Design a protein around this nucleic acid. Structure first.
Ligand SMILES: [Mg+2]
Ligand SMILES: [Mg+2]
Ligand SMILES: [Mg+2]
Ligand SMILES: [Mg+2]
Ligand SMILES: [Mg+2]
Ligand SMILES: [Mg+2]
Ligand SMILES: [Zn+2]
Lengths: 131, 134, 38, 140
RNA sequence: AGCCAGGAUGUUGGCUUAGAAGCAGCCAUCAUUUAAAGAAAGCGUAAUAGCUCACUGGUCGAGUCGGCCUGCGCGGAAGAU
């Protein structure tokens, strides 16, 4: 109904799934067609990774009071974040792969253990293994 | 790069294939019998869509897809033609297990892996074709 | 062009412009739609 | 009776009549059958049949649709269009009165590198304007 | 408002048609992943192809859109010493 009341709903939904998330992986999405994003979206459903593009202002508001606050430095530019409903630290590997293979977007940041990890030092998430 | 819908066992006719990829430099005969070679397994008289993929050196590859839903929906329904106009007359009733059979047939084409969602997409398409579900 | 008393937009590309106290209709799509209030 | 064109596909049934014993000749019934025929023709729905000829034009592919557009301007219906490697072949059935001088028109649309063929196919009823056209000229 | 991109998938919805493939027409118009997606509001093709739009994310960083009433103006407005 109300676009402010839709924001009251989108903020409450993206933060409620941030309650159960384990590792947040944020990245860029501009310059890529639709069906190419669904190559990852099917890859997120099978790995239990929730992927949802929300606005930068909305994101900060939502993640306030949550361990993913330090990510306010990376919420500029087009934003494609990934949550880890199950299998913690798995989104990252998939993300990095797709990025360097065929697109122009990069991995803005990751968010494990409620701290911010810069783009080049995220091989740490890749090194961590599924258990 | 070109997309066609070719009969399961026959690539012989000139007008459907000749002009579209002749400019691309596709060797007609090659694609004809490669296409037929792999589409041998398809049921007789199933029109199947193929995406032909040509490169600067005129060489090509292709992917075969699942037949168009409307062609595949009227065969299960056993209705040779199509509904003249919906919301007035329905030519038959499509079965539910057939919708999921159709859903797993075009599993690759559908973007949703929910399978039940695939059925809804197929059912929605059928609804536009004037059929009703039991 | 159409020099007439009633000038108006005839399509979605027609634009009303005033240039010397003269209302004109200029169209970037159809040159038939060129009008002038006179 | 309408214009002078020959009547076609007509069935006649002589259910009743009258005959005088001493004044009935072959020509008297000929005049009598002709009066009745003319009277019936006007009461009935009398229409012209134009001839339609099968047309197969062969054209370069760059100016295909213009040929089709001119065919639709010559009041013709279409039954297909094959596209060979040498050039497109369009099939049609155009009335003969609208097939007059097609070669110079077909050459103008195609840089003069098209060709065509006409074969007579069937007869078909003309629309009201062309039927009204052939009646005024023939009548006067 | 401008600019950077997407503008999906079943698919060329079903009929009609030589072709009707978002875009001749009739009958619809609803599922899909969605940030968002008209079985397209336009251009275009013989049909395709192709170009935009609606709809969205970013950038930007402060007002902006559509009507109603009303004051004063503008065009309409060419004649003979
Ligand atoms: Mg059709
Ligand atoms: Mg259509
Ligand atoms: Mg069109
Ligand atoms: Mg005012
Ligand atoms: Mg005035
Ligand atoms: Mg005035
Ligand atoms: Zn205009």
């Amino acid at each position: 109904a109300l676009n402010l009341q839709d924001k009251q709903a989108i903020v409450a939904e993206v933060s409620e799934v941030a309650k159960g998330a384990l590792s947040a992986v944020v990245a860029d999405s501009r310059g890529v067609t639709v069906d190419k994003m669904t190559e990852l979206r099917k890859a997120g459903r099978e790995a239990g990774v929730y992927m949802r593009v929300v606005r930068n202002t909305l994101l900060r508001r939502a993640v306030e009071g949550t361990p993913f606050e330090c990510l306010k430095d990376a919420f500029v530019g087009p934003t494609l974040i990934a949550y880890s409903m199950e299998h913690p630290g798995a989104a990252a590997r998939l993300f990095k792969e797709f990025a360097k293979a065929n697109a122009k977007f990069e991995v803005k940041a990751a968010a494990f253990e409620g701290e911010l990890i810069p783009a080049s030092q995220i091989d740490r998430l890749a090194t961590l293994p599924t258990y | 790069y070109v997309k066609l819908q070719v009969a399961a066992g026959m690539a012989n006719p000139s007008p459907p294939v000749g002009p579209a990829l002749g400019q691309q430099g596709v060797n007609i005969m090659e694609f004809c019998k490669a296409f037929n070679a792999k589409t041998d397994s398809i049921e007789k008289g199933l029109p199947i869509p193929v995406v032909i993929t040509v490169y600067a050196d005129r060489s090509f590859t292709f992917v075969t897809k699942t037949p168009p839903a409307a062609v595949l929906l009227k065969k299960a329904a056993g209705i040779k033609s199509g509904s003249g106009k919906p919301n007035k007359d329905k030519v038959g009733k499509i079965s539910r297990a057939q919708l999921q059979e159709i859903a797993q047939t075009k599993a690759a084409d559908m973007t949703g892996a929910d399978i039940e969602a695939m059925t809804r997409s197929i059912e929605g398409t059928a609804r536009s074709m004037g059929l009703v579900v039991e | 062009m159409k020099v007439r008393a009633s000038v108006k937009k005839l399509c979605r590309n027609c634009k009303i412009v005033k240039r010397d106290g003269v209302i004109r209709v200029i169209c970037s799509a159809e040159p038939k739609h060129k009008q002038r209030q006179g | 009776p309408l214009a002078g064109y020959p009547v076609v596909d007509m069935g006649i049934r002589l259910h009743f009549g009258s005959y005088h014993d001493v004044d009935s000749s072959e020509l008297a019934f000929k005049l009598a059958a002709s009066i009745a025929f003319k009277e019936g023709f006007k009461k009935a729905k009398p229409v012209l049949l134009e001839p339609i000829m099968k047309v197969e034009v062969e054209t370069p592919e760059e100016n295909t649709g213009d040929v089709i557009g001119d065919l639709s301007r010559r009041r013709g219906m279409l039954k297909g269009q094959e596209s060979e490697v040498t050039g497109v072949k369009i099939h049609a059935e155009v009335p003969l009165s609208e097939m007059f001088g097609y070669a110079t028109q077909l050459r103008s649309l195609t840089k003069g590198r098209a060709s065509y063929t006409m074969e007579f196919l069937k007869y078909d009823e003309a629309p009201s304007n062309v039927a009204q056209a052939v009646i005024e000229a023939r009548g006067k």
